[PDB]
Amino acid sequence: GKNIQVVVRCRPFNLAERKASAHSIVECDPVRKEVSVRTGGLADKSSRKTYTFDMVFGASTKQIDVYRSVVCPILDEVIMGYNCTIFAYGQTGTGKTFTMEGERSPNEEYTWEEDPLAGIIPRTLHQIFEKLTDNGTEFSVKVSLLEIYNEELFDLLNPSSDVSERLQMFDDPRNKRGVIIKGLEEITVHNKDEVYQILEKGAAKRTTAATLMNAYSSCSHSVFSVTIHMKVKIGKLNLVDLAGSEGNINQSLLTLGRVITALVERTPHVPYRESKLTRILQDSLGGRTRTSIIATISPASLNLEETLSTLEYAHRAKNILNKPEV
Ligand SMILES: Nc1ncnc2c1ncn2[C@@H]1O[C@H](COP(=O)(O)OP(=O)(O)O)[C@@H](O)[C@H]1O
Ligand SMILES: [Mg+2]
């Protein structure tokens, strides 16, 4: 048992992976919490090497079923007054954005229930207003969205400053192992339905940067921060949508791995300082908290080598052995 959690969410076959008639190699066992892969294709060889994690979500896994298993325990700790972080790992296209951001699916006006395709970000905000309005707590909710492209920090929330100013950041004398992002826009949310309008602003700004600087989302980290003031508790929840797993980006992810590895093994000299991403979330990983990681993979034999790497990263972060009968 640990405060660090590592789960794996496989994705179905997309039409493109179908269009080339690729065939699955990923086996998801949620009960045993295992996920296995093969090696040969038409050879149908005996390829063991099965992995075990804290939880496993198969191809039929639904969005709500991920929020309940992964986010609900963490949100309660945030409302209690702690800082937390949720991560999404994996090859571009596996489903980090579909898991962290969700969709809407053309169906028009939605009442007050969550969209079935919504992600962690839609659900977390709406559950924040519901749970804190129900227990009559006085609260204020403000969110922030920056983007780490090539290790320079960009705000996707500011309406002004249309191009791209690398935000400056320095350790604030106020709390150590903490930092302050000068100039970072902090949009204050009033209604729970406001979160959908904020994902629109940042989307274009992420697109405007993707076209006028080659700041494609696939090659950048996405940090969503929601802070909750309550009465006197302050809670923060960081939802990080990491860049695709596969000279400077491949270092920030390996740094984050070194951290979580160091966080799981109680080891000293965890090098938060080795990257901008780990330095920002330092106040969310050092101070004892609940950290969760979601590694998204593809079931096609097309992406065999990357699906193995991603699972390999997850094993390195929190190593747990496979138990009897693999
Ligand atoms: N669990 C899922 N259910 C349905 N569609 C999914 C799922 N995961 C991914 N997708 C689909 O795959 C794409 C989402 O990939 P994306 O989130 O961009 O990966 P990444 O964010 O890691 O680059 C979309 O085409 C979406 O339709
Ligand atoms: Mg994406």
UniProtKB/Swiss-Prot annotation:
Span of domain Kinesin motor: 3-320
Entry-annotated residues carrying N6-acetyllysine: K131
Localization annotation: Cytoplasm; Cytoplasm, Cytoskeleton, Spindle pole
Residues engaged in binding ATP: G90, Q91, T92, G93, T94, G95, K96, T97
PTM info: A subset of this protein primarily localized at the spindle pole is phosphorylated by NEK6 during mitosis; phosphorylation is required for mitotic function.
Tree of life domain: Eukaryota
Complexes and interactors: Interacts with the thyroid hormone receptor in the presence of thyroid hormone. Component of a large chromatin remodeling complex, at least composed of MYSM1, PCAF, RBM10 and KIF11/TRIP5. Interacts (via C-terminus) with the kinase NEK6 in both interphase and mitosis. Interacts with RARRES1 and AGBL2. Interacts with TPX2.
Disease field: Microcephaly with or without chorioretinopathy, lymphedema, or impaired intellectual development: An autosomal dominant disorder that involves an overlapping but variable spectrum of central nervous system and ocular developmental anomalies. Microcephaly ranges from mild to severe and is often associated with mild to moderate developmental delay and a characteristic facial phenotype with upslanting palpebral fissures, broad nose with rounded tip, long philtrum with thin upper lip, prominent chin, and prominent ears.
Family designation: Belongs to the TRAFAC class myosin-kinesin ATPase superfamily. Kinesin family. BimC subfamily.
Function: Motor protein required for establishing a bipolar spindle and thus contributing to chromosome congression during mitosis. Required in non-mitotic cells for transport of secretory proteins from the Golgi complex to the cell surface.
Protein name: Kinesin-like protein KIF11
Organism expressing this protein natively: Homo sapiens
Residues of the full protein shown: 16 to 365 of 1056
